Amino acid sequence: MLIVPYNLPLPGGVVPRMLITILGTVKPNANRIALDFQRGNDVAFHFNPRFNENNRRVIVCNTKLDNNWGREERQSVFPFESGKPFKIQVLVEPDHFKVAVNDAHLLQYNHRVKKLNEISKLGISGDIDLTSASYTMI
């Protein structure tokens, strides 16, 4: 059990082989979730499930640089369900973040922000009950 929004420090930033695990439960009438891997004010990797964007469910990924969002990458595979417990795993790989939900691969997101060891915070926000947020090296 954790207060949302939650900030998880990533000491010394991220590195290939680092695995971030987020456990929570989606609220009953959810509208959105967001993970924000941040490099200061920049968002290296924004992972944003939207439950009702024109009555469709979509995952939006993006990067924010100098307060400007870039080109979205969109995924229609949508593994989250209002009311249900989930596990998000984000594995840092050399060329991308690799995301699996509930043990099934979901998407990868190529590194736009190159200075991995400056991506030193993860913000977790939105319509969830947050159970845990942690990391380990595999």
- In eight-state DSSP terms, residue 32 is B
Residues 72-131 that bind ligand 9Q5 (CB under 6 A): 72, 74
Q: How far is the CB of 111 from ligand 9Q5 (least distance, A)?
A: 17
CA 87 to chain CA centroid, Å, is 11
> How many residues interact with ligand 9Q5 (rule CB under 6 A)?
8
Exactly one of 4, 25, 32, 131 binds ligand 9Q5 (CB under 6 A); that residue is: 32
Q: Is 12 annotated as a binding residue?
A: no
Q: Is 75 annotated as a binding residue?
A: yes
Interface region with ligand 9Q5, contact rule CB under 6 A, candidates 20-28, 68-76, 85-93, 104-112: 68-76
Nearer to ligand 9Q5, 74 or 105 (CB): 74
- In eight-state DSSP terms, residue 116 is G
Residue 117 phi, psi (nearest 5):
-75, 5
56 lies in the binding site for ligand 9Q5 (CB under 6 A)? no
Nearer to ligand 9Q5, 32 or 98 (CB): 32
Return the structure tokens found at 123: 């913000």
Q: How distant, in Å, are the alpha carbons of 28, 46, 51 from that of 55? A: 16, 21, 8
69 lies in the binding site for ligand 9Q5 (CB under 6 A)? yes
Handedness of CA 60, 22, 77, 99 (dihedral sign): positive
Name the β-bridge partners of 45: 37
48 lies in the binding site for ligand 9Q5 (CB under 6 A)? yes
Residue 96 CA to residue 91 CA, distance in Å, equals 9
**Contact positions vs ligand 9Q5 (CB under 6 A):** 32, 46, 48, 60, 62, 69, 72, 74
